[model samples]
Target: NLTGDIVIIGAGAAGSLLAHYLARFSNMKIILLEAGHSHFNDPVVTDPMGFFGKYNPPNENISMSQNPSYSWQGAQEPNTGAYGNRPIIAHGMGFGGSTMINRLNLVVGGRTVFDNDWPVGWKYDDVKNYFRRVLVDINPVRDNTKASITSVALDALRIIAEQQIASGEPVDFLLNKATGNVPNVEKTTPDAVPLNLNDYEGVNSVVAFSSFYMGVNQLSDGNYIRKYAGNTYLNRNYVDENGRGIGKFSGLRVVSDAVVDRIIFKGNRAVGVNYIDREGIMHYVKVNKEVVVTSGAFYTPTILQRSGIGDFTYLSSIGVKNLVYNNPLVGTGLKNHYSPVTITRVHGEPSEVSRFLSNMAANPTNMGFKGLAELGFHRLDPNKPANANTVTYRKYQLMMTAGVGIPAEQQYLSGLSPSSNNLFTLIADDIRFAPEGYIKIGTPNIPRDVPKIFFNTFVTYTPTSAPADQQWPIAQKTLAPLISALLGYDIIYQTLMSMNQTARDSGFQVSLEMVYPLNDLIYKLHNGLATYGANWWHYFVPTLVGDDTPAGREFADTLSKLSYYPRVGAHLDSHQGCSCSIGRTVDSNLKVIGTQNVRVADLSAAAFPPGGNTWATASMIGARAVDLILGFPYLRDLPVNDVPILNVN
Candidate 1:
């Protein structure tokens, strides 16, 4: 048995970053255990587009999909039994978790998400150091606290802002840089000492677009790379069979293909974990100081439940021994962003299509739309207000596809058929969802068996129940779980037009022109409302419930709501969380409320994300967990200045 300072399970985004930071910063020994593949020799990590090919694949040995799979049950229509054939969520397994194969998006919500939506101490400012640690600090000059703006809003604003300039606006790329992210090229690592946190903001005109808040950077050879936790953290610096690192740090070892069965406990304290290898041998790895679980929102609860840590009732039914059933909120609130794809299949024969492809090379933003290219923001619904001046909203990410990625093809769509022009996918990830999801063991027991997950994504609207944590007071209807008015029609169309012009400027003539057709389709269905969630995923992700009981029912009539029944999406659940959220599930220090020395440091912590993907906060939580464990500030020398403090500049 190998003993260490910290045994981090699931070396994905949060886990890998935490491992990198803690190992680099402290002399403590860290044991990083992942249930899937190790990232040492994986060449697929180089191509950002190659991520999806690994995301939640069928087999465990060759891919990144988790065990017990993300197999969920829901509906094609609310309350109706009909559904898709497979689970939608495509979480990355192995050492990097979803970070290894994610869409390479590096975005952080504005101050509102931190100050308003999050718990007091876990707000945006508190975790800034962690963000800087994991990703590059593109701008170290400005205080990262300001009213938020979306990439979409700026896209539209920049075009309009240009028209009035010199009787015309500056014809520069509006999104040259913004607050959210930079994706490929930043090369952010754990221990870049001179934190170049730019303390600067965008200028009104030409210089304004120069500020790229995202951390991606370009290479000397004119190539780019997305920030994958596995690839980023494991590039070099380990001494193993592969001769991994050159640095002096030891005690940090990442093992792949070992599926964790359950956490071991001595009384209420978590001491170790029992995982199974491919040879079907059970192995035990013990931790000296702490055992942190960074297995993401789904499996974190599963590990605990199998260890007898969740609800007493569910544990008993699963035939698992109940150790500490004090926490009732294990694996309850499951939330994922919703983006229904609409395609525009272009006209003409194969000749025209080939020519269009030729023309598309000049337009750089095409691949930017896929996986995790760009993250946009939309305003909050009037129903959900905030306590502070900082209001929260959803993460809007739209992608332009090389070819139509589904086009809502094949079966399903329930009495609706829409036309397509050619290709392009617009994924609108609304971060404003409630935890309408649920999961459980399938009459279970296991070291290797998969579990049953119920993703209540659509059908029954999600709202407040019992006591409210931050925004709404306890007992009333859900004030925060929102369903938009125009379903962001104007925002979608305008953003489309913006990108439309953007591509045109760079010499790509064609743009997304499926606006009114999609308008007609949805209006013909949900009255221009979002009747579905992440449609890109070709299967059922959530089980529907009755509208008579769920909270957000008051927004419209029964039929209006019912018509949009049973929506699901590509199970790329970037925002699934809160089943064991702060205040309700875990405590302030991230202790599992009832347990001791055990903590959750993944997307499961936040009840709601302010905007963008959960990438930035997941890394922050990992850093913060280290802080709590060591009782030492990780970034002691971190600057608190209001300007970029780089001496060179």
Candidate 2:
């Protein structure tokens, strides 16, 4: 059996960064194993638009995530009734993990997220320094280059504001802010979305309109490149000219295609690991120090289950001997930011917006700013304070983009007329802290099979249909001028009663179909029915109308008929976390409850679902894990404070 000081399973967002820090600060003999191949530069991975191109449809044959060579593909079980059962899901298997596939949405969540959900020391102040340190390396920036769609979109908003102001209409400059053009935005405007990761207030809370920060670096020559764990953290060549490396890390190794089976334990402590190589040869490595499971939300808990450190009853039922068992929360408490979508079919291409994206595609330097890489809206209830179970604490996000198409399944559910074209999709995501889903192993086969997922979609949905929150409607109205100018029509939210009346007035009928078997023939027969699926209510106007015409005004009125309905969306952001959660399965130090030397250091260990995209927080957790493991004194002891806006050049 081989030996290493520390063995990190799954060289993903957290694992890779953890290994990098261990090598950087300490003299540990680190072994990082990834189930997929080595990291290499591929256009599909480096391009900013790659995420939209590869993952939108999620077909097994067409989507890049279906390739077992680099991705772990699965589905969220059919038993997850309503909201269309069996939605497909995938995770990163190789080095860098899902960061290699996720959109570069550099969100780090809000202070309320940490203060309210995490354990004592893990509060916003305690972890703010870690976020700052990681941001220095990741170097997030808002790419508002002249050739970018983001820049164009911002200009469009500016023009509308200017035109409105010129025509004597009141304009909220703070609400319509862009980091690139607005000076001292974070300080001057409380409502402007902050680009600095340190500005927890702006990044975490909601705003009417603001350009988002991207995890990218702009070169001196004015070109932008994506930065992720592979480049930012694991890009080191630890070897020397004489073929010898520095210190104990001289044996630093990152082995690919190594499928970890389970942790081999001695009594209550993890002593080694059993992993199978690509050649199907089983190998064992004795761990001298510790075994950290960084296999992410789905696989980490499964690894623990196979190692017999999880729910005793479940393990025994699976025919696995219960060794060091009884942590019932091991694979429990799964959470995700489920998204619902709103589709808008314009009469013609929004020329100004269309030409800008076209230019972005034609220019290689602006590749980082193409597609949905630009603006996003994050808002919370103004009346509620940041506390558990309150609307302010549980945030909502609106990501609007032009020219993005829907998958066949989404298209079918959207009820878009076959004749309609020029689509603009808005992805609305809700932030709820409760655990409504789970991940459980199918058989006693261990790592041979992926865990089954149950999203438990719409568990919190009420049948009585509570009055829709005023936040989304207000935000939509705030953008009414800009949207009307951009797309030549208004998008509004109509109540079920008013929507039906508008539909009736427009020579059509609106119906609320029963939420059951989605594929029933009733859906086909009643095309105008707006069925509540996932979390939101959505249905687009099917008939065409001319700009500024009476039919157009009527069309615009009815468009809000099925718009912005209540409840979280059925679509998941795939930012799943809090499975082997802190204070539950693992302590603050990240050590497993019943085991002495095993730890969980990935998204699964997050005490709560991260406020933003999980990749950034995953990397931060990886960095902080090093400090916890090595007993390093926390650096930058200052409390959480918002730094001045530093625009990317």
Candidate 3:
């Protein structure tokens, strides 16, 4: 039997970050047992060029090549299929988990959203201190003021904005609405509509835009954006004074090949965990203080149910005698952000925007003056406050163009170039619609491969639809027109032609561009939909005037396996409260419910997916978890100015 004061499972964003704070701030004897290995020194994981190529491999250090995994199990056939014909879910089983492979967008929403939805103790002011404390070394962009744009890229953006405006559709600029901030365009003169950056700033909220556009960057020259935060917080950088990175309790203990079977519970309290080592040797590690499960939304529930902590009826059938139904909400609240990607190929020589990406791919260390220009784009308007529910699209656009890439330019150029393509991916985070999915026991005994996941993508709309039901019609009616509008008929046809050519040229079996406007609307309409029921109404518009043209129908058919009037699209693609679990799977106090000694401190406790990117939030959760475990008063103090300011009600 082995033991430590604390055992943190799954050394990803939350687990590693929590361990850092515990080791640095408090004097706790902690043991961070990851299912992966130390990957900081792995060149394959760190090199930007190598990063995107081997996207499927579990991190370079921890090899889960032999382990069983699944990809996009629920996605539809044909159009909305998985990337490379496989599902594109979050990566599991690695030291940094999904962080190692993700695009590293470091975005976080304003305090208003948190204050409104999170539990009483986890308000904006309460968590803000921690956010500031942890993100100090992190350098987020100031605003759109630093956005970089090239002449060709700006020309494409202007075209997109002009088209949208002429159609009376809302054209959201990062800072302004009326004045187009398209780079290279002449500023509006007094006789013409003034186009100064200030005129654009006058109408939109700059802070909202800035905060949303921020992301962690890894330049080709080896300079990383927000380096300290992602590297130190998530990667295995901890060590004893001796400087050795191995041995028990000395260096980072990331056991890559170990697959945890289940938690060993002593009645209602969790005491230890049982897992299979690299050689398939079943071993058990006892937890002296608490067993923290940080495996993430999908796996946490699986872990709990494996240990006989789920539906009692399901547990009884499996012959597991001990059953503790502490909070029936254990695996109930599962949420994920769903968005459709729209691609548009432009006609031209590879624009500076395209060349930049190409340069990164060919020589992973060649960021030119373009990178600096992006860092100095204009600022968003500072006055108008952001809405609590929706993400500021203007900020997103600027960030994508200046910080990430020019959307219209990328899309247009991608179409024009035979080798590279430009694309615009529309993402929505407002998940007012809550859909419930559950984890159940697949096998009765020896729960190694017994966990099964059921993700009801549109639980709000189709309760009866599951693995068998084809609810394409319902989805099509709800989403198709919105998608068509978002991608005007002209662009849609262009993309279809480009996608077909690209697919054929690349020697891929299928090629198609999928849209998810319906999915976004459904998610927004259904935000809290599981609890609230379907009381939301979606507005529909007639198809574009020439959409009924033969070319349009052909393009539509290529994307949807189901027919048009029945008009369904194939690629229709596809968290919550602390009370259920805050710190590590327990309340703010870190006490496991109905038990005295046990506690949970990983992602399981803070089950709610923060409205934005979850990396920082998870790190913050870890920091807070460590504080709770140490019984520090830093977290318990009341807000210095507690005046219950905004009534979102």
lDDT of 3 by residue, 375-427 (tens): 11111112122441132322221222211222234335333232445433222
Better of 1 and 2 by lDDT: 2
Q: Cα RMSD (Å) between model 3 and the true structure?
A: 11.9
Residue range 74-171, candidate 2, lDDT tens digits: 66776322434566667776657887666677767756668777888888788877777666667676536333323333334444333433544222
Clashing pairs counted in every model = 52, 5, 45
The stretch of ten residues in a row with the least summed lDDT in candidate 2 is 486-495
- Each prediction's TM-score versus the true structure: 0.69, 0.70, 0.60
The most accurate candidate by TM-score is 2
Error of 3 at 67 (Å): 9.5
Model 1 Cα shift for residue 286 (angstroms): 3.2
Off by over 4 Å in 3: 54-88, 137-237, 240-256, 347-436, 444-450, 458-586, 590-592, 633-649
lDDT per residue (tens digit) for residues 425-519 in model 1? 44444555543666565543563234566653433233433332432332112322223312433345545556556545544445445532244
Candidate 2: residue 230 lDDT (0-100): 61
Which candidate leads in lDDT?
2
